[PDB]
């Protein structure tokens, strides 16, 4: 019995920090069981109770125990023969037989003798020494122990027999369930966490019950490992049988606990048996809590009607629990707290937790006390902090049991428990951490409330320090708000708690009334309460709960007296509520808002308040189509307070709407005046949507430039920061006839922001020079060139050191140009892509298709030019010196020999494709031999010398969008190493710029042969940058973390631009090519198979049917490109479950936004080479989207068979739950956000597509004369109407169903995929 009683002492000896004791105890422990792997694994899984180890990471002892079985006397060695350093004499073995047969002093002999003695000393080294030292290092290091166990247990498992494996798995299943592990719960890592991670790697797999997996995930910080294991089990079982039921139950519970609302919603949409459940989930997922509540009620009525016929199976009970839980949640979001408190107090069906959450909000403190007692007897551990906080609530606010002394300790306990809960959450912060991040504010506000109530005690009441503390806490509460992504329940918590304390202040300073005879303290409490009510109503309105907001705002009338500011804000919020309602209802809500405005007793309100009221009245009358009265209202509003930006903006919108139809120029001038007067402030984010209208209106200008004259007149007083984002559009206008009057505007912007203007103007000027040289193939400079030169001259005069530094930087960029090998390789790849496009155009006639004249001229240019201010002359001299190379001459000669178009059979397209592939492979072999980096000192003396003393130069792209503050990152260094990387199917130089903050910013120097395409790509990037702020401002988009990833691109010349690199980024084709290289197959094989099958079918005198294309895609998927390539890549790349989960979720949401943009904005197709995947974060960016303008008609087409890339490898990686839930929900949320009328996305689209249409006209149809104003306006309106049509179609969400689901089904559908270009890779 003594040895049984001393087990904790023995386990203390095993984990002792003193190595001698630990060694003796292990020696006793090692001999206690046989030297066999299976028996020792059985010991650690069944015989050793690990509870007495305590918080020790007892996996260390498992490692020590199992390694002891290894043979110790064997000489140390490895299977990694390719990594071993070879022998000195190994050169003999590598040599041929002739040299070996031919091969067959004192200092050297002594050296070789001493070395032989050394090598003999090493040959004596045994594996046991490494094993023992390894075990000791595992004792000292927990990270090493965890890694070694995760690596080692699968390997031990593999060398077991099948019988041993089955027995060990059957014993492992209860081991994970053992109570002894409960002490590990707060260990970081848990030993059981590491054990479960090791098991997941085992092949064959070890089955674990879904409920056990969920318990381990929530208990031992195994959240995402358990989630991914349950997902895998679900997909293996085909997503019903009780096993599938329990798998989906555990997976849904994990999604709910992880606050993964979209994943849970998708799972239940597939799982649910009642269509009302899916409809309610779709409604609730997007904030339609009233409709979701109605749907849950209809579902409950249907279920009750079915219960009268027969009982309910236990398979449907999770759906009923879902209905109850989400109906309660919807009631919480709809501010129905009284009904919930009543519902929780229902006899026989009491819910003390619901009452405890609800009763305090409606001042039912008796129910709060009862619920607190019931919860305290039996409470979940995660809810402990909330119980302490509610006990503090009762201690402060209960009418009889006020105890303010307990609040400090209750706050400390709540904070400690919340921190404890935080450490049990995943290390990557996500939606699961939001409740605790809200709890932080809740707890500190509990403490601040305790301070206020201590101030209101009769001893402290009226004292100066108490008043000062009260005022300080009230102001701090006023400024400290939650965010729009927060559920309305959290806003309710914060505001109702604050309301209790504001009412306490009011009661205290109204009852006493001895001090403060002017009632300023009571007025302070009343004003705070009214402001909190108005803020709550405003947040309800912003989240779409307009009826809830109107109900909340109606509680202001309960207060006897309110300050006029709060009454003004209440009326303003009501008016905005009616405007929002009229957006979908129409005339009646406008009439109600007009009635509210008319009932307003203006006489108390100030001039600014009256002006705002009349502006709201003008908006309402404009929606009613009472144009004359609306104009009266706007005029009176602006005359009342001529600074009110909103009055000017709304009057401008009204006048622009009239101008677009009637087209009298004076209305255009009035609209431009209004818009420009609205922009006369530094808040650039507000004014951005107005300057877009101003720029769009210039398309309606006459031959006399009336609108440009108005812009020139009124634009004075508009700070240049407003124009920073527009600068591309400003330059587009500058090239036109209106540039004469807009020169002053651009000159002022260049004066204040020289770096922002300089590179665009430099690029535009050099583009104009190139176009002029092409036109007259010295020439007098055109008017746009003169204007650009004037702007640059003014900038050189005002900022000579800055512009001299920028010019020096750009002049250095010439050395970054690629060598001739890389240029010829790039041109071969581009020509191959063009040949593929032609081949798909000529798919009808494979084996008969001929090359187009464009491809003929391209190859002729390649063979004619085979790849080959002082910096430019020296570069030309270096280029000439390279031509001397005889190898280059031989390659040029044989290249010209292969690409001679006079030989028979060379004009065929597919023979050209094969020749291109051969030569691409040859040059890829030759390119790999080139140096991978070069030092800036070798050629770029200015960059190496450059420092902050040279000029205050900002890192490129800082002015693409005006940063809200002047915290611009300036350039401190150019790092001496420039790297050469293969990206975008071109050889690119990566420049590293060190910033004054010390961070290293990577930039790629890129060479583009085509100017217009680069401008179009930058145009799309600018549109994406402009759209991003809208996503930041709406719920449903902010809570899903939706944002476009737009890398900084700055053009420094027509051919060269600086891009903002992520060195951890790969393209999807690069992943595919890596998989093919590992598999040994060529990556272009599927395209060859596709065209060979087409030729085979066509040779039989028939066209390929849809079934033939389906069969081709099926063959490619079965043989060459399996569905699981991307998934297997992700599994290898992110072995940590949390990293895999985060990457996959970010990938899903970014792909949702990219596909939405591709479909709604009629962009060109997303090739897998365009899709850049950031391994370090999961963010996706596209290099590069362009508008799909039809060259023959200038209107948008984008009528491809699929709406976006949802190709089978992507679908497999996302999983069906990821496609259904987060992808669809993110697309719907983005569509609904961009369709909001207040954002005015149509104006930004008009001002971007105006530049796009001008570019198309210059490219196809053509002081050069501007294109016809009517043609430009019509084309832009048609393109914007098409975009907004697709946008509104996706935004429509009537009935809980969205066209986005059909769009996703079409994208995934194999029928549509098989009809795509093979170069698109419809299998990848």
């Amino acid at each position: 019995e003594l040895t049984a009683k001393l087990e904790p002492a023995f386990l203390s000896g095993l984990r002792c920090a003193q190595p001698l004791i630990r060694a003796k105890f292990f020696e006793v422990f090692d001999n206690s069981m046989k030297r066999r792997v299976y028996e020792r694994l059985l010991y650690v899984t069944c015989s050793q109770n690990w509870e007495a180890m305590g918080n020790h990471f007892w996996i260390k002892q498992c490692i020590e125990l199992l390694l002891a079985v290894c043979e110790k006397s064997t000489p140390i060695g490895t299977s990694c023969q390719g990594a071993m350093l070879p022998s000195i004499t190994n050169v003999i073995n590598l040599a041929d037989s002739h040299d070996r047969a031919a091969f067959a002093g004192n200092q050297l002999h002594m050296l070789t003798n001493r070395h032989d003695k050394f090598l003999d000393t090493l040959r004596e080294v045994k594996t046991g020494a490494l094993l023992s030292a390894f075990v000791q290092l595992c004792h000292i290091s927990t990270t090493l122990a965890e890694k070694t166990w995760v690596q080692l247990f699968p390997r031990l498992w593999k060398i077991l027999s099948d019988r041993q494996q089955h027995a060990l798995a059957g014993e492992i299943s209860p081991f994970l369930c053992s109570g002894s592990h409960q002490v590990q719960r707060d260990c970081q890592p848990s030993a059981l966490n590491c054990f479960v991670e090791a098991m997941s790697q085992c092949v064959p797999p070890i089955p674990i019950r879904p409920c056990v997996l969920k318990y381990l995930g929530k208990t031992h910080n195994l959240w995402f490992r358990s989630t991914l294991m349950l997902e895998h089990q679900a997909f293996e079982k085909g997503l019903i049988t009780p096993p599938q039921q329990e798998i989906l139950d555990s997976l849904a519970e994990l999604y709910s606990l992880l606050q993964e609302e979209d994943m849970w919603a998708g799972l239940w949409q597939k799982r649910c048996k009642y269509s009302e459940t899916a409809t309610a989930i779709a409604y609730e997922q997007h904030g339609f809590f009233e409709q979701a509540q109605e749907s849950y009620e209809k579902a409950m009525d249907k279920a009750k009607k079915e219960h009268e016929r027969s009982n309910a199976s236990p398979a449907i009970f999770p759906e009923y629990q879902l209905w109850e839980d989400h109906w309660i949640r919807c009631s919480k979001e709809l501010n129905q707290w009284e009904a919930l408190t009543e519902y929780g107090q229902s006899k026989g069906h009491i819910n003390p937790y619901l009452v405890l959450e609800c009763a305090w909000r409606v001042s039912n403190w008796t129910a709060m006390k009862e619920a607190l007692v019931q919860v305290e007897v039996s409470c979940p551990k995660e809810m402990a902090w909330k119980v302490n906080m509610y006990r503090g609530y009762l201690a402060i606010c209960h009418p009889e049991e006020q105890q303010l002394s307990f609040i400090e300790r209750l706050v400390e306990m709540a904070s400690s428990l919340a921190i404890r809960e935080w450490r049990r959450l995943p290390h990557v912060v996500s939606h699961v951490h939001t409740p605790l991040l809200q709890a932080a504010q809740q707890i500190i506000e509990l403490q601040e409330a305790a301070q206020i109530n201590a101030g209101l005690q009769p001893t402290n009441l009226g004292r100066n320090n108490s008043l000062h503390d009260m005022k300080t806490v009230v102001k701090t509460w006023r400024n400290r708000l939650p965010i729009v992504s927060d559920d309305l329940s959290h806003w309710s918590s914060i505001f109702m708690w604050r309301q209790h304390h504001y009412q306490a202040i009011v009661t205290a300073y109204e009852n006493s009334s001895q001090h403060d005879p002017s009632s300023n303290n009571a007025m302070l409490g009343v004003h705070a309460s009214a402001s909190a009510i108005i803020q709550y109503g405003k947040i309800a309105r912003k989240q779409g709960l307009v009826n809830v907001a109107l109900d909340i705002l109606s509680r202001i009338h309960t207060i006897p007296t309110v300050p006029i500011v709060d009454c003004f804000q209440k009326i303003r919020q009501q008016v905005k509520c009616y405007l929002q309602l009229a957006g979908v209802m129409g005339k009646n809500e406008c009439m109600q808002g007009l009635e509210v405005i008319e009932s307003t007793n203006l006489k108390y309100f100030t001039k600014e308040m009256t002006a705002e009221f009349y502006a709201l009245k003008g908006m309402f009358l404009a929606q009613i189509n009472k144009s004359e009265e609306a104009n009266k209202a706007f005029s009176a509003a602006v005359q009342m307070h001529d600074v009110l930006v909103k009055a000017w903006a709304m009057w401008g919108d009204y006048l622009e709407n009239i101008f677009v139809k009637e087209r009298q120029l004076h209305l255009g001038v009035s609209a431009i005046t209004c818009y420009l007067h609205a922009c006369r402030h530094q808040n650039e984010s507000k004014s951005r949507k107005y300057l877009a209208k101003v720029l769009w209106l210039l398309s309606f200008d006459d031959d006399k430039n009336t609108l440009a004259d108005a812009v020139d007149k009124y634009c004075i007083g508009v700070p240049p920061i407003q124009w920073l984002a527009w600068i591309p559009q400003l330059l587009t206008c500058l090239v036109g006839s209106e540039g004469k009057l807009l020169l002053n505007l651009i000159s002022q912007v260049g004066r204040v922001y020289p770096q922002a203007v300089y590179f665009p103007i430099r690029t535009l000027y050099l583009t104009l020079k190139i176009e002029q040289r092409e036109r007259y193939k010295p020439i007098r400079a055109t008017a746009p060139m003169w204007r650009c030169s004037r702007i640059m001259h003014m900038q050189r005069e005002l900022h000579p050191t800055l512009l001299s530094s920028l010019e020096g930087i750009v002049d250095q960029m010439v050395w970054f140009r690629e060598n001739w090998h890389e240029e010829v390789l790039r041109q071969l790849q581009q020509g191959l892509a063009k040949c593929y496009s032609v081949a798909f155009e000529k798919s009808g006639a494979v084996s008969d298709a001929k090359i187009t004249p464009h491809t003929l001229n391209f190859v002729k240019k390649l063979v004619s030019t085979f790849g080959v201010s002082a910096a430019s002359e020296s570069l030309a001299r270096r280029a000439q010196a390279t031509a001397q190379d005889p190898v280059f001459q031989k390659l040029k000669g044989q290249f010209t020999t292969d690409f001679d178009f006079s030989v028979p059979g060379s004009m065929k397209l597919h023979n050209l494709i094969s020749k291109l592939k051969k030569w691409i492979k040859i040059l890829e072999a030759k390119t790999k031999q080139l140096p991978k980096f070069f030092l800036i000192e070798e050629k770029c003396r200015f960059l190496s010398n450059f420092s902050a003393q040279t000029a205050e130069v900002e890192i490129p792209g800082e002015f693409l969008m005006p940063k809200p503050t002047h915290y611009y990152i300036k350039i401190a260094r150019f790092m001496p190493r420039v790297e050469i990387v293969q990206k975008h199917n071109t050889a690119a130089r990566r420049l590293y710029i060190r910033g004054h903050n010390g961070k290293i910013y990577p930039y790629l120097v890129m060479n583009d042969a085509c100017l217009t395409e680069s401008r179009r790509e930058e145009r799309v990037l600018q549109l994406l940058r402009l759209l991003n702020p809208c996503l930041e401002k709406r719920k449903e988009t902010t809570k899903r973390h939706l944002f476009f990833t737009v890398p900084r691109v700055v053009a420094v010349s027509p051919q060269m631009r600086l891009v903002e690199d992520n060195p951890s980024s790969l393209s999807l084709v690069e992943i595919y090519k890596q998989r093919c290289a590992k598999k040994g197959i060529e990556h272009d094989n599927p395209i060859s198979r596709y065209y060979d099958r087409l030729a085979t079918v066509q040779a039989r005198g028939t066209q390929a049917s849809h079934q033939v294309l389906r069969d081709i895609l099926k063959e490619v998927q079965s043989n060459m490109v399996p569905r699981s390539m991307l998934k297997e890549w992700a599994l290898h790349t992110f072995p940590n479950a949390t990293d895999y989960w985060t990457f996959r979720k970010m990938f899903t949401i970014q792909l949702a936004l990219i596909g939405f943009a591709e479909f709604v904005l009629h962009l060109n197709r997303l090739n897998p080479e365009m899709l850049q995947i950031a391994q370090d974060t999961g963010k996706l960016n596209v290099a590069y989207f362009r508008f799909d303008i039809n060259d023959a008609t200038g209107d948008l087409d984008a009528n491809r068979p699929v709406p976006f890339r949802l190709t089978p490898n992507i679908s497999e990686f996302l999983t069906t739950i990821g496609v259904s839930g987060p992808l669809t929900a993110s697309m719907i949320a983005v569509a609904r956000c961009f369709a909001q009328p207040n954002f005015k996305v149509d104006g930004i689209l008009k001002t971007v597509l105006r530049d796009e249409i001008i570019a198309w006209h210059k490219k196809t149809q053509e002081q050069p004369e501007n294109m016809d104003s009517q043609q430009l306006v019509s084309l832009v309106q048609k393109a914007v109407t098409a975009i907004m049509t697709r946008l509104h179609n996706l935004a429509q969400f009537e009935g809980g169903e969205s066209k986005v689901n059909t769009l996703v089904a079409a994208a995934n559908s194999l029928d549509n995929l098989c009809r795509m270009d093979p170069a698109w890779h419809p299998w990848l």
Binding site: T3, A4, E7, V28, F29, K34, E39, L42, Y43, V44, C46, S47, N49, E171, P174, F175, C177, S178, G179, S180, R209, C211, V212, Y215, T219, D249, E253, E297, M300, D301, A303, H307, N311, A312, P314, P318, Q336, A339, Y343, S346, I350, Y353, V377, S378, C379, P380, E598, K607, T610, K632, S635, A636, M640, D642, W651, L655, S670, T673, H677, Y714
Partner: protein
């Protein structure tokens, strides 16, 4: 499977539904692999009532604590298994739990069922509402006012 020998071997406020009791018994039997009397078969497999509480709460009508689950098992299921819980579960035919959900749906349905003078201030400002000024004139008035304010400041 026989575990290897070690050096330490000595050589309730809401009523419980039958579905909850059945989940409790099945959790203890299947997951913990313990016998009726919770006698330890393998030293490493000590009873874990937190896991059982998690299992029970997956289908329970109210949160059951681990202590409550242990007390219920020891004080009801052991004496009952020594009609058995399986027999009662089979005979109930999910009627009681269905009626529970019917009652909840009825309570939720009950809760759901239980649910001029304006010209005077313009005339004081000097605004002729019935004769709108175009934006050009209002901008001119703003400029004149700003110029007069600047002159007064100077």
């Amino acid at each position: 499977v026989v575990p290897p020998r070690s050096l330490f071997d000595r050589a309730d406020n809401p009523e419980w539904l039958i579905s909850e009791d059945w989940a409790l018994l099945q959790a203890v039997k299947q997951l913990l692999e313990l016998p009726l009397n919770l006698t330890i078969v393998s030293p490493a497999h000590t009873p874990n009532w937190d896991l059982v509480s998690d299992v029970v709460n997956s289908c329970s009508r109210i949160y059951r604590s681990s202590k409550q689950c242990r007390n219920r098992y020891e004080n009801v299921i052991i004496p009952r298994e020594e009609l058995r819980t399986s027999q009662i579960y089979a005979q109930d035919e999910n009627a009681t739990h269905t009626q529970l959900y019917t009652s909840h749906f009825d309570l939720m349905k009950m809760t759901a069922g239980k649910r001029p003078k304006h010209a005077s201030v313009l005339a004081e400002s000097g605004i002729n509402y019935d004769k709108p000024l175009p934006p050009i004139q209002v901008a001119s008035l703003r400029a004149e006012r700003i110029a007069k304010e600047k002159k007064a400041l100077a």
